[PDB]
Amino acid sequence: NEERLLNRFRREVMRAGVIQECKRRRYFENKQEEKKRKHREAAK
Amino acid sequence: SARKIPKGVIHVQASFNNTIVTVTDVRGRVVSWASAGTCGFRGTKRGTPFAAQTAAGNAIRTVVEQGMQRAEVMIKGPGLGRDAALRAIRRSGILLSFVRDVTPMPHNGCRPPKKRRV
Amino acid sequence: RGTVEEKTAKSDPIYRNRLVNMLVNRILKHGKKSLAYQILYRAVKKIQQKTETNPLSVLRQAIRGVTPDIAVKARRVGGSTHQVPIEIGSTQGKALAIRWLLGAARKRPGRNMAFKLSSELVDAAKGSGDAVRKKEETHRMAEANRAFA
Amino acid sequence: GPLSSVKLILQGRNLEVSDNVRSHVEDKVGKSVAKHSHLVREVDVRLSARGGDLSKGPKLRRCEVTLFTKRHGVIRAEEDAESLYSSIDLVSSIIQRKLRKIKDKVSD
RNA sequence: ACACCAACGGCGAAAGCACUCUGCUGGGCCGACACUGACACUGAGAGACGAAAGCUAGGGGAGCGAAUGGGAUUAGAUACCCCAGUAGUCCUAGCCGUAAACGAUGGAUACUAGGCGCUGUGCGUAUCGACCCGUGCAGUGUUGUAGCUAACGCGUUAAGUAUCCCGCCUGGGGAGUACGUUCGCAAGAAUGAAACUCAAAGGAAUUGACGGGGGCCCGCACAAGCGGUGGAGCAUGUGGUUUAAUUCG
């Protein structure tokens, strides 16, 4: 072992940010366009 | 005592405000658990990476009656308690085979509750 | 503002030491530099009278036991006040060391400032008195809150 | 400020002050900053009057209230109205908003 | 209830519609002349559908969660926070017919630069087979000429140029209220005034100020020190009180 962290590095493949997303309420296209517009532009 | 086999799973319930470091065998009878509320301090302090380090250390320091070589860790959930816990287990340095995530990834099951507005 | 121009620090008047000159500037109260000079060298001539080592050795060995490695800086994030400890530098620990040493030396009564600074100085040299206890109570508070960062 | 409150200091310029004036001051100012729980240090209420039949200019009654509070700064409000009573009620309203600005800004 | 797929994507007249599969069935688009020969457009009144919440009847009820109840913050808290939590949420059969039901843009046809796209089909190139290039159309998007516009902007999907058809508007309150009538199990929906009162009510843009909106940078501004005031005594100044005056500023 060495102090390298590939679980965090691999973790951003399918981020735990789908769990900070799912704590608060099911809300419609205003905040899904805010979160998924900022997310469709974060990957481009 | 226990079955006395030095391989066994470790689960880390890293909550948004807490951590739980439990350790159990292959069948699932727990040999020890120790959380952030276990190791003394309690309140807004628990659930920080010092609580993950101390709770993991006081969790797996009591398996020296076993002396488990082949470790494997199965963490769960979001929070600031993951990376300090893995640095704690790698600090104890026992034969960590593979860490893994078993977090509940729902397929739109239940409605999560109201947004906070704070 | 950016920075301070680097530093100029001279050594001791009669021993050529940059620490003891720092201590004679810290015992100075309003310009009476010959009197603070007098108090420090009567403390050294007192420390030759108590034990029989170098006063640099008992002084530096004293202030090693006063200097902290970490202290509480009550910082803020988002309006929330964490008591998070941040590792203090070296010469900062010198200034704090002779700070607590000197102010605590201005409490132990009975006799003139030579005996007062001598007594609290050897109490720093033996882990007793009040300056090293002040090190502990400012040291066991930053130890008490490591759950912040 | 009858009891337990901030220390009251009046100023009377061009104005002979009466019972109803400073009574209306401590009751309107003091009893509208009576639901406070504030240890404000000092209230300077400076109550001057001007003009109309007194001198040149329209009839004016002008009050300034200043609070030297511990709680995040000092505040002052000057209003100028047709009567003393409308002045002091109006400054009473302004200082209600300024103190709710202070208390409400202490949050989290 | 249906993660990744999910796309500035496809379909529907709109509302809406996404786990997959099957069945019945609507609608769109494209080609050949294969047929009829103006059968077209709009639409008063009318009829249908019509998110969510609501109501009748019966199921069902995990999560979430009005009301409610307790705890907290708070001067107070019927609220934001937290813990329980009922109607409701889902389904069957209905009623209700309103939404920022928004593209804040009724529908239809004809005509008027381009660039960059996406979706569906069609032709030719290229290979002979997936590509790939141009294109013929239809639809969807983004910058944009002309023109229009008070401006912002819109711009072949016009807010352009014209033609047709229907609706609705004529200052702001009063007021989507009053009264009447129809509909509705009720909740209410629709139709819809006036008395009186005001000289404004509004739109777009600009300049400032301000923000418990950002970004940047100084200042003994905070932080780090050092020394004080506030405590005591006195000197002095002011306010108040008193006095014939305690001059006035």
Residue A12: which domain range?
A: 1-44
Number of domains in chain A: 1
Chain C contact for D108 (CB, 8 A cutoff): yes
Give the resolution in Å: 3.7
| Touching subunits for chain A (3+ Cβ pairs under 8 A) | B
- Amino acid A23 CA to nucleotide E17 C1' distance, rounded Å: 27
CB atoms within 10 A of CB B13: 16
Q: How far is C149 from chain B (nearest CA, A)?
A: 8
Q: List the structure tokens of C2.
A: 């950016």
- Locate C62 and state its tokens: 């004293």
Q: Closest-CA residue in chain C for D105?
A: C79
- C&D contacts, CB < 8 Å: 4
CA distances from C96 to B97, B101, C3, C90 (A): 48, 48, 21, 10
A and B touch per CB criterion (3+ pairs under 8 A): yes
Distance CA C14, CA C41 (A): 9
User: Three-state secondary structure along chain B?
Assistant: CCCCCCCEEEEEEECCCCEEEEEECCCCCEEEEEECCCCCCCCCCCCCHHHHHHHHHHHHHHHCCCCCCEEEEEEECCCCCCHHHHHHHHHHCCEEEEEEECCCCCCCCCCCCCCCCC
Query: Rounded to whole angstroms, how far apart are CA atoms C28 and B52?
Result: 49
Q: Using the CA of D102, which nucleotide's C1' is the nearest one?
A: E212
Cβ-in-10-Å burial (0-12, 13-18, 19+) of B114 comes to: exposed
Contacts of D107 in chain C (CB under 8 A): 79
Range of the domain at D93: 1-108
Residue C81: closest C-alpha in chain D: D108
Contact check, Cβ <8 Å, A26/B112: yes
How far, in Å, CA of C88 to CA of C110, rounded? 35
Q: Which residues pair with B33 in a beta bridge?
A: B22
On whether the CB atoms of residues B49 and B81 are closer than 8 A, the answer is yes
Single-letter amino acid code for the residue at B76 = K
Token representation of residue B65: 């009656």
**CB distance A24–B93 less than 8 Å?**
no
Query: What's the gap in Å between the CA of D9 and the closest CA on chain C?
Result: 35
| DSSP structure class, residue A12 | T
D69 to chain C, closest Cα gap in Å: 21
Partner-chain contact B112 A24, CB within 8 Å: yes
Distance B116 CA to E12 C1' (A): 37
| Residue B53: exposure state from Cβ atoms within 10 A (0-12, 13-18, ≥19) | buried
SS (H, E, C) chain D: CCCCCCEEEEEEECCCCCHHHHHHHHHHHHHHCCCCCCCCCEEEEEEEEECCCCCCCCCEEEEEEEECCCCCCCEEEEEEECCHHHHHHHHHHHHHHHHHHHHHHCCC
For chain C, list the domains and their CATH numbers. 1-149 (1.10.455.10)
Q: Show residues, CB within 7 A, near nucleic chain E.
A: A 18, 25, 36-37, 39-40; B 105, 107-114, 116-118; C 1-2, 29-30, 99, 103; D 9-12, 35-37, 100-101, 103-105, 107
Q: How far is C136 from chain B (nearest CA, A)?
A: 21
Sorted by sequence, the CB contacts under 8 Å of residue B27 that are 6+ apart come out as none
Q: Compute how many other C-beta atoms are within 10 angstroms of the C-beta atom of residue D80.
A: 18
Q: Which of B52, B4, B6, B11 is nearest to B28 (CA)?
A: B11
Contact residues, chain A to chain B, C-beta under 8 Å: 1, 3, 5, 7-8, 11, 16, 18-20, 22-27
Rounded CA–C1' distance between B107 and E19, in angstroms? 10
Residue B59 domain boundaries: 1-118
Instruction: Kindly list the residues from chain C whose CB atom is less than 8 angstroms away from the CB atom of residue B51.
Output: 147
The CATH number of whichever domain residue B13 belongs to comes to 3.30.420.80
Structure tokens at C88: 């203090």
CA neighbor of D41 nearest in space, from D65, D11, D71, D64 = D71
